[PDB]
Amino acid sequence: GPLVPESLQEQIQSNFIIVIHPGSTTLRIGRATDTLPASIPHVIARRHKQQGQPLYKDSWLLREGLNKPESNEQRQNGLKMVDQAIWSKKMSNGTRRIPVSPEQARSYNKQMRPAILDHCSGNKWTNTSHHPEYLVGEEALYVNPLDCYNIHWPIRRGQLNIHPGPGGSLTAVLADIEVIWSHAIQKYLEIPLKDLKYYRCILLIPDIYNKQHVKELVNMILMKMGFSGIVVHQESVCATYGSGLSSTCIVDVGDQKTSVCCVEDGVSHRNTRLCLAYGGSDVSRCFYWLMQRAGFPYRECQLTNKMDCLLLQHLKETFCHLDQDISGLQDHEFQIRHPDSPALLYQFRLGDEKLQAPMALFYPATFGIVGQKMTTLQHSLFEGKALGLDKAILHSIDCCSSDDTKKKMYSSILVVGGGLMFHKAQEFLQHRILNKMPPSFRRIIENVDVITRPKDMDPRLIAWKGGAVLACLDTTQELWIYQREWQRFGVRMLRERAAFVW
Ligand SMILES: Nc1ncnc2c1ncn2[C@@H]1O[C@H](COP(=O)(O)OP(=O)(O)OP(=O)(O)O)[C@@H](O)[C@H]1O
Ligand SMILES: [Cl-]
Ligand SMILES: [Mg+2]
């Protein structure tokens, strides 16, 4: 409650604490005093050192296992489960939702031609005339695909993006992280790197984390970048802080990973931890596939193409919904303003695809991913099969030992991150939870409450905000690990001094 005059707010403690929340697609970074953190595409373009090197592009909306022999059938059967769930749920007036045909749409759609809004789109490729060794964030996304740059996303599906080839070693990934993080600090926080010695860092990490990798990051923060101290915490607990819910089931739907777990007073219960290998991006790809069947008028779209991918993400965020009551064929329009093209405006007609795609989050077989580990527990048949979001929430809560805990968890489900930012998502999910949960508890419990915009904030920023909040906490004074303790004892510090059980 200490209100600080503007003449002094650059001198309070939290002005010298940098809060860092990495993501597969977006880095969120800022001073603990910033109201909004900077949001950067967590990506880097690196120049070739020679002529005639093959262009490496990281996968984004594509991933392994989409084209196995079984992929197409699995996709089909999932979409039938989605459809069954859609039909099964009556509309507000109590009637059935009348399905509309993809073919009916296709007929109208591929008579559609784009109009031009402008001769030039108004966007251009990042300029690389001066041969930068690298580019970061949005500048990286806008590198002409024909330029001699490899594109690297240091994080995929919420873990370090290690893979065969250039940029895929642990060391390359760490160097890319450092370059990306350092660039953001100088450019957006406007903090010279030589000054980091006066700063401390709060690093948010996944609920289920990799000890070795966290170790490395901490080493990077303290030793390579020059922060004097650091505090590491799980993004799930931070989410609870940012939202003000001491006890709650937390679900973080990101672009590529979905976390579920139960948190009780700053503690994520290991036995309740689940990580699912899908998120917003999978929905984006699915929506694309559905739209193609409806005669999607942009016919030269490709999933391997960054600009197209931004378009698909955007289309999903504009059209997709989880509202039973929005039905029928609707007339829509969208723009394309890519570099090297005109500003284009497209008419087209969409039906159930707008609802089917987001619901694949509850029927993830729809993604048609075959032969991959899809589910992860904290230190198998259950892993290779993808688990719907609601089943995961339930399963997680069911892994609480106490029943008073469970009462608390069913009663409060917090949903965080961007992945589930669809219209009516809160209601939609609250409805499934009621019907799907154990009926014994459904009675004992006054209501199931799903929270999506707590305090009416941006779900993408809740955890980051919690990180800042964590810096103000009294118990936090004892969490800091400082450079010299690290240089000396290293990993021993985390075992001794981590807020969570290392
Ligand atoms: N209004 C919206 N409607 C639907 N989806 C949205 C909306 N806004 C953002 N998203 C989605 O949120 C996802 C990104 O969420 P977020 O930035 O929390 O992920 P991340 O932290 O980068 O990824 P991860 O947590 O998987 O590592 C993207 O798939 C994006 O399309
Ligand atoms: Cl906000
Ligand atoms: Mg995330």
Author numbering: 32 to 410, 502 to 624
Provide the authors' original text about this structure.
INO80 contains actin along with Arp4, Arp5 and Arp8. Deleting Arp8 in Saccharomyces cerevisiae results in an INO80 complex that also lacks Arp4 and actin, in addition to the losses of DNA binding and ATPase activities.
To provide a first structural framework for Arp8 we determined the crystal structure of Homo sapiens Arp8 (a truncated variant that lacks the first 33 N-terminal amino acids), and studied the solution structure of truncated and full-length human Arp8 (hArp8) by small angle X-ray scattering (SAXS). The crystals contained one Arp8 molecule per asymmetric unit. Except for 91 amino acids (R411–I501) in a loop insertion, we obtained interpretable electron density for the entire protein. Additional density in the nucleotide-binding cleft could be interpreted as a bound ATP molecule with one coordinated metal ion. Since ATP was not added prior to crystallization, it was retained from the cells throughout purification and crystal growth. Despite the relatively low sequence homology to actin, human Arp8 displays the typical actin fold with a central nucleotide-binding cleft between sub-domains 1 and 2 on one side and sub-domains 3 and 4 on the other side. The most notable feature of Arp8 is a long insertion I (K80–H162), which emanates from the ‘DNaseI binding loop’ (D-loop) on sub-domain 2, binds across both halves of the actin fold to wrap around sub-domain 4 and reaches back to the D-loop. All in all, insertions I–III appear to lock the two principal domains of actin (sub-domains 1–2 and sub-domains 3–4) into a particular conformation and stabilize the active site cleft. On the contrary, the nucleotide-binding site of Arp8 exhibits only minor changes to the residues involved in the catalytic cycle of actin’s ATPase.
